[PDB]
């Protein structure tokens with residue numbers, strides 16, 4: 093429940109209303125909570141084949157009142173945990189892909205020449221001062237190269 097108030101804070105009124113419409117769809121008998129059987133129906137329609145224990149595990153994750161079912165507030169907690177997981181996955185994909193694009197010769201690090209080339213190719217004029225500054229900040233051991241960990245660190249924020 094303080095967790096439920098916390099979940100609601102990550103969302104706008106409109107997002108909560110969309111989740112409410114989804115919640116009601118899943119709640120096949122319209123009683124106010126999603127059961128293991130109701131969860132299973134939606135999962136099977138999504139192509140999954142969870143076992144009864146796996147369905148039970150999913151509900152238990154957020155079942156704060158021990159009802160063995162997911163009410164709307166618990167559902168919001170589940171949705172927010174998932175949105176957070178998805179956001180983190182999207183960021184990791186973007187970071188890896190960005191590195192993949194900058195490291196043109198695939199030697200494991202980005203050097204000044206590669207930085208400059210990707211910006212130019214992207215249609216952006218970047219000054220030498222700017223490249224210098226980027227290298228100063230990203231390159232922590234000062235060897236003129238930004239390896240994957242430095243890149244991650246320099247991308248934080």
Ligand SMILES: [Ca+2]
Nearest residue numbers: 119121123125
């Ligand atoms: Ca129900």
Ligand SMILES: [Ca+2]
Nearest residue numbers: 155159161163
């Ligand atoms: Ca519950």
Ligand SMILES: [Ca+2]
Nearest residue numbers: 195197199201
């Ligand atoms: Ca390289």
Ligand SMILES: [Ca+2]
Nearest residue numbers: 202203204205
């Ligand atoms: Ca080089």
Ligand SMILES: [Ca+2]
Nearest residue numbers: 215216217218
């Ligand atoms: Ca510009």
Ligand SMILES: [Ca+2]
Nearest residue numbers: 216217218219
């Ligand atoms: Ca510029």
Ligand SMILES: [Ca+2]
Nearest residue numbers: 231233235237
């Ligand atoms: Ca370095």
